[PDB]
Write a protein that binds this ligand. Structure first.
Ligand SMILES: N[C@](CC1c2ccccc2Oc2ccccc21)(C(=O)O)[C@@H]1C[C@@H]1C(=O)O
Length: 756
């Protein structure tokens, strides 16, 4: 119907919708000053203060073509064509559109004519296609940045398992996608993700609260929701007598109005709000205008029908205006496009203060791709009192500043918002103004998985949801290799206290206590006392010293074998070397053999004689060497050990033993000896032995006795292959006992009537 033109030399158009939503008999709706006058004036204001300030080229006035807009996309396109017709004097850019649908259709047309645009309250939900949208930008940052801020807030408080709720529309979907992308980048698991809105009614709002409340692994409701829909969730929360921490978009607006009716829903909730900074000059200019006399803006007459109770009797100054962030953005926007034109004038009309024909074709041809994008311009025409920029980057983007509030139980009044901090470039907060997180008060409820593992728990658990990483205890034969696993260190190696290393089954010998005062540790070193002294008795009693060892030994080899029995047994407890394995096979092998062999040999001489010492001895010794040489070959081919590692799941090792299965390596020597002992008793049928006494008494008593003793230990010695400990006494006793039994019976008859 009308265009609010402004006289000037160069003209910018715009869209600050006057009217809202209409119906079947109405082209569009009622007039609304929060879309209309407070923004229509913001541009007209800026244009004249721009026209007066020398930061614009001083001889060129910027006029206007403000489109007769309604908050409708269809309407905006039909009207936008008027800019196109003006440009086929003409339009050098358009500032306006209070909704993304208004901005998009106007821009869809204008881009084709190389005319740039500025938009408000529009988002990346649709305005992300820079391949076309580099022609224009928002002054108002897109809503999705708040979703990024939400993810940052949540990670800063270590909320890593959260519930995402967003509005039923495009705002909501955009917020969810942006949130989830940032949330994953920050290692935040999103426990739930859903849309809400007034359309689903109250039962559904309770259903949403119950969906999280009845699954309280997360305890924060992250709301990328417009104000009305948020109010219905908060009401549901109180109807259900419960609350969640809420983390909120600019749809909470820093306003008690979205909350306080169900204020208990929200205590300690955090809201991102779109930052707002006054220009006192507009508020003063604007509030002080009186269009009843000031012809600048005729659309006031329609707004006045409701602002004033009729009609010029009521001056404009009688009724106040809201100093909205929308004003700040519209004023700033005009300042940016104006300073882009200032640079465009220098670029196209460098020689004057007036216009040149170079700018007569629309200069939009150079503005949209350059001059209106590179616009921070170091805060030209004096914007809001940050004075930091108009906006930066402008890759379809607006300012990007957001403040952070919290909703506090100011119970002396109603629960209230207070300034915690801000985001914009990054998150800054006083957590003490957040009783959610405040020192010595903040419960930081749940909303993370039990990720920490016991230091002794490794195997990774992903119980359906990989978000909750849990651990399984390490098998104690393995050690920690990584956070999610143990490595096998060999079974005989169990994890150590170091976690990442292992405990080796130790090796040790003395396990015999008081109950074992009769064990190897006392046998091996004491049994010797019964026999080794004997050789000195013989020296005192060696009646024929004239006989050399080569013939003398015929009656001493047996004593030698007895003494060796004890010597070996002692070493077997005392010396944790290869020497013990070596000796169990080699020294012990004759120590016990001699105790029977010497007597078998004597017995057969007796059997042949009754009913030349050099050869008698050489034979007695040859019969001993014959077994030692088997063992030497064994020792050379199969070298002796110390430890005897086995049964690694539990077993301590000794260091004083063969690592070999012993079995027959000691066994066949022991069995040759048993057979010798029994052969002697057979040979003894010839019971006749005169030598000082009838020795038939003593050799009988001796061998009947030792044929029981040797035989007595063989059932253990060559059998209990499963044991680790009895063998020590099996050997200590069997051999040392045979030792004292034979001299104590054979030599003792003489030995102690002389040593009497
Ligand atoms: N459609 C939105 C609505 C956006 C908004 C902008 C200007 C004026 C009112 C207003 O309403 C809210 C309420 C909460 C969050 C964002 C907004 C848009 O106009 O750009 C935007 C997509 C996001 C959404 O759906 O929620």
């Amino acid at each position: 119907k009308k265009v609010l033109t402004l006289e000037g030399d160069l003209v910018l158009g715009g869209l600050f919708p006057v009217h809202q939503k209409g119906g079947p008999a109405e082209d569009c709706g009622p007039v609304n000053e929060h879309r209309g006058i407070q923004r229509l004036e913001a541009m007209l204001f800026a244009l004249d203060r721009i026209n007066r300030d020398p930061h614009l080229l001083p001889g060129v006035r910027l006029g206007a073509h403000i489109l007769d807009s309604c908050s409708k996309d269809t309407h905006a396109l039909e009207q936008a064509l008027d800019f196109v017709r003006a440009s086929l004097t003409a339009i050098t850019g358009v500032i306006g559109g209070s909704y993304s649908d208004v901005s998009i259709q106007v821009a869809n047309l204008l881009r084709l004519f190389q005319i740039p645009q500025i938009s408000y309250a529009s988002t990346s939900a649709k305005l992300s296609d820079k391949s076309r949208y580099d022609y224009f930008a928002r002054t108002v940052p897109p809503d999705f940045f708040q979703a990024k801020a939400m993810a940052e807030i949540l990670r800063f408080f270590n909320w890593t398992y959260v519930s995402t709720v967003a509005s039923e529309g495009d705002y909501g979907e955009t917020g969810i996608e942006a949130f989830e992308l940032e949330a994953r980048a920050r290692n935040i698991c999103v426990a739930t993700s859903e849309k809400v809105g007034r359309a689903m009614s109250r039962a559904a709002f309770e259903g949403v609260v119950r969906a999280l409340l009845q699954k309280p692994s997360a305890r924060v409701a992250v709301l990328f929701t417009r104000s009305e829909d948020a109010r219905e969730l908060l009401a549901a929360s109180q109807r259900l007598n419960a609350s969640f921490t809420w983390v909120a978009s600019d749809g909470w607006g820093a306003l008690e109005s979205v909350v306080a009716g169900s204020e208990g829903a929200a205590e300690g909730a955090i809201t991102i709000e779109l930052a707002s900074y006054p220009i006192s000059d507009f508020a003063s200019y604007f509030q002080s205008l009186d269009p009843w006399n000031n012809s600048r803006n005729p659309w006031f007459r329609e707004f006045w029908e409701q602002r004033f109770r009729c009609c010029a009797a009521h001056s404009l100054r009688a009724v106040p205006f809201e100093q909205e962030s929308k004003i700040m953005f519209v004023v700033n926007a005009v300042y940016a496009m104006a300073h882009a034109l200032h640079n465009m004038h220098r670029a196209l009309c460098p020689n004057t203060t007036r216009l040149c024909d170079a700018m007569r074709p629309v200069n939009g041809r150079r503005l949209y791709k350059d001059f209106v994008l590179n616009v921070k311009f170091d805060a030209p025409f004096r914007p809001a009192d940050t004075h930091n920029e108009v906006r930066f980057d402008r890759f379809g983007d607006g300012i990007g500043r957001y403040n952070i509030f919290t909703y506090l139980r100011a119970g002396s009044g109603r629960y209230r918002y207070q300034k915690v901090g801000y985001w914009a470039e990054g998150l800054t907060l006083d957590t003490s103004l957040i009783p959610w997180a405040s020192p010595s008060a903040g419960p930081l409820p749940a909303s993370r998985c039990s990720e920490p593992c016991l230091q002794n728990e490794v195997k990774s658990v992903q119980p359906g949801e990989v978000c909750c990483w849990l651990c399984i205890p390490c098998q104690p034969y393995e050690y920690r290799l990584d956070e999610f696993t143990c490595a096998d260190c060999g079974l005989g190696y169990w994890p150590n206290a170091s976690l990442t290393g292992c405990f080796e089954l130790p090796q040790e010998y003395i396990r015999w206590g008081d109950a074992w005062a009769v064990g190897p540790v006392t046998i091996a070193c004491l049994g010797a006392l019964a026999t080794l002294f004997v050789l000195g008795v013989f020296v005192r009693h060696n009646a024929t010293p004239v006989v050399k060892a080569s013939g003398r030994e015929l009656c001493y080899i047996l004593l030698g074998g007895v003494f060796l029995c004890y010597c070996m047994t002692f070493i077997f407890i005392a010396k944790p070397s290869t020497a013990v394995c070596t000796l169990r096979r080699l020294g012990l092998g004759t120590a016990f053999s001699v105790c029977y062999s010497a007597l078998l040999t004597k017995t057969n001489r007796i059997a042949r004689i009754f009913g030349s010492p050099a050869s008698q001895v050489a034979i007695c010794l040859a019969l001993i060497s014959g077994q030692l040489l088997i063992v030497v070959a064994w020792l050379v081919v199969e070298a002796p050990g110390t430890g005897k590692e086995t049964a690694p799941e539990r077993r301590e090792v000794v260091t004083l033993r063969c690592n070999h299965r012993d079995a027959s390596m000691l066994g066949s020597l022991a069995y040759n000896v048993l057979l010798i002992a029994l052969c002697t008793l057979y040979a003894f049928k010839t019971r006749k032995c005169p030598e000082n006494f009838n020795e038939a008494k003593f050799i009988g008593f001796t061998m009947y006795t030792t044929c029981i003793i040797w035989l007595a230990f063989l059932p253990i010695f060559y059998v209990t292959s499963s044991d680790y400990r009895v063998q020590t006494t099996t050997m200590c006793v069997s051999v040392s006992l045979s030792g004292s039994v034979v001299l104590g019976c054979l030599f003792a008859p003489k030995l102690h009537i002389i040593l009497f």
